[PDB]
Assembly symmetry: D2
Amino acid sequence: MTTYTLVLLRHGESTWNKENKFTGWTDVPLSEKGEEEAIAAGKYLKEKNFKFDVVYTSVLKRAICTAWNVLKTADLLHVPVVKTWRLNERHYGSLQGLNKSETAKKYGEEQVKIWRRSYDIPPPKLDKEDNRWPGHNVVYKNVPKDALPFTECLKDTVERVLPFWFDHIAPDILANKKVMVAAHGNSLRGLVKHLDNLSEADVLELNIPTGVPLVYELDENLKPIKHYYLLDSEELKKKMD
Amino acid sequence: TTYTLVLLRHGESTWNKENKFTGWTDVPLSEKGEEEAIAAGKYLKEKNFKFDVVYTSVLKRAICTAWNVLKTADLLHVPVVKTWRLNERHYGSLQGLNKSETAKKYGEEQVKIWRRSYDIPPPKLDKEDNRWPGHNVVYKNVPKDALPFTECLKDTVERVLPFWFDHIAPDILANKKVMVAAHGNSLRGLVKHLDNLSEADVLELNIPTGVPLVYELDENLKPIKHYYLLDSEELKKKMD
Amino acid sequence: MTTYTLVLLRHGESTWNKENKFTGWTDVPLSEKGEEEAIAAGKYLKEKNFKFDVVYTSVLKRAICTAWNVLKTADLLHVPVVKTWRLNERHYGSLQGLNKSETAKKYGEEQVKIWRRSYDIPPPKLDKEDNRWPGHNVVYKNVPKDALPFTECLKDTVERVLPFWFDHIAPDILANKKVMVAAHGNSLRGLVKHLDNLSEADVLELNIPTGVPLVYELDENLKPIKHYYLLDSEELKKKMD
Amino acid sequence: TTYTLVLLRHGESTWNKENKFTGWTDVPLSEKGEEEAIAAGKYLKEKNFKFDVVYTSVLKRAICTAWNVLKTADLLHVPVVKTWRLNERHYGSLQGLNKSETAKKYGEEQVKIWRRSYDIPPPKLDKEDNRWPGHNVVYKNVPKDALPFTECLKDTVERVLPFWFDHIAPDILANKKVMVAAHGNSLRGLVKHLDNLSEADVLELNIPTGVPLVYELDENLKPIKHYYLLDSEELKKKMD
């Protein structure tokens, strides 16, 4: 008898995408193009008449600008925005800032694949005393420093995402408010893993395109009914890589 | 003692050019207003001002000012909390009307009263007026009977102070750095409290746009002093 | 088509009621009898099947024990409780702690009546440096000291109550949750003044008995439909003084 | 450095006398449990311990302990925040059963495992069991799929730590005085973190009932030390 609507939105391209450095929690801005992706997304949302009561996002700039550009375009600047580290990209450990190929040559090309493409084998942990430690960064000034990863594997990311869904995202949906989550591909993958109740296998085969709204239709027990991408079926096919 | 409070008043909207009275009319920042917010931001950064929280109204000429400052200072991660209690002072039947049509309706004399008094609101709207804030989904979560049909500066001060007491001040008291990016009239409500000003002093005070106003406060939130964080003379030329 | 239910509950007798001192914000406990009043109220609520999602109360002990005894009796100890100075008794100024008759003889017997029974003429203001100033009292450690009265008249009490209704009590009711307000007669009178939209006149003629639940039935715009006391019509008649 | 954290574990319930495993079964404090909460309170007062906030579970043997302490210390005005994340560790199919009927069903050997391991939960309930927490209106605001069918100490630790990170610890970090009045297993989850304990050390540790456990912490929330705020020998006699 009753249906809920949730919107997941990955962030568009960033400065590092055309550079091949591992990024993780490194705070890179959107690029000209990823700015265009969030306005467009917003434009589509407006045209199809999606309204929001809450927007949840990471504390990483590239997702915050995404949420913001959507709301501006859709004329919902008044909508409250909740930012949480719990929505961040998967942390890349000592790999952060480092060049993908130059690390495929300072280690096996099969080592970087496990670290990149597996589910539960994390890259080398950072030291606390390294300057990339999140705990040195004022962004996390107001968060117990022991909550912050030295390194993550997708399973760690999922585990730190799900509390935020049960405590905040999910009550909201259950309270009859329309929520959008503008986060990162890995954190959004933690979210669909649970929603679609995916095995380790399938969730690793799942690729979420950038800048494309993912609409989930959920029942009274928040189990999906269906899920669809809001795009024209010519950009979507292109956008699927 | 610490506690540094900064107040930022938004730059002009698109309607300043058209001389249309705005009030709660949710009009966007003009391209000039926008740039002022960025200057303010370039200036806060250059003195190493940080914030743990931002407070703002629900009208977008105010929220973009917040945004621009945080983008410019590289503080995008900071919480932003938007309340109707920080809204511009409501402008009753004047909303949407330009100075001209306003003179033609009420005469230039009545309008000076509604623009210059503390006490005497402009003509009031009612529930058969599509400007009534109760019709505006932006407020679908406020008991409609909390929402103004019109306002004078006093009304504006009265609804702003609860938000000062319930949220702004307790944050300052926890050791938090807060910026309040809002509107002339809502900001003057804060000041009238902070500086213990009379009805008469609150009227003499204009707050320039795009200039951070910094308050240093003692452990009881009484100002030690306050200053505009801008150039010695550009500060005077901006008060116009 | 849709109806809301709000429960206002005054607190039962206190130690000072059988002493004749002006009490105001003075933190006196319930008496044996007022403890009995809150359990009974709770008992009636349980028997008639009233459930709560939130309880709002003052920060004065005598109302807190009331809320608590109701919830215990009604088996709702898990229900969150929000305590606010904004729900306090009307502040009695320099009168606090002082004896009603001994102040009818240190001043006109018509002066104490205006101070007691009028709407907008407050008793003499306390000094900050007096030990009765609320701002010295840790109960208010976490509240800007400039929010706290030196003295109140009912109009002041109403004015400081209504923000709490618009910000917190009212959204809750509007959100489909069942609320009880366990506060004080003067603060509850601020609340019905607004609900029934009473003149100054009528609200001053209004006497709320202690320990008796006051049920308001409200429509989609939170305007009352009806309001009734949950008691047997033999105690109620007795209890009306 | 400051930060004084106090942990208080509730006294016995009415079911300790009946030897019935409780878990999430919402059973009241025994008259003895009640009195322990008051002693704890008389002791906190006598050393002038204050709190700005109280954290507790949603089960009433824990909330009354909070209450009693605050009544005894004359701190009734203090906020009390009740979360399912601080609930006793769930006891699966054992809930409602006494030691006897438990031996008759599973044998005394399996039960020691479920009482003594870190890793191996008791037999799990399902949605056709009226003990399932999802049926209990107490949780009508929690997505049911967050709610346990059974638990071992590890499960209990895993769901308690988010509440430590999202609420308890940031309060300590703002300069707030917090007491956590809860259950043995939920409290041991806190300690396992605070003292950096292994799976093996967390098992050796019993927390006595009705004795405030005080932690002094450094600016990073690492303990400097911790002590039981009770009598030199009565402390040993209570560990039994």
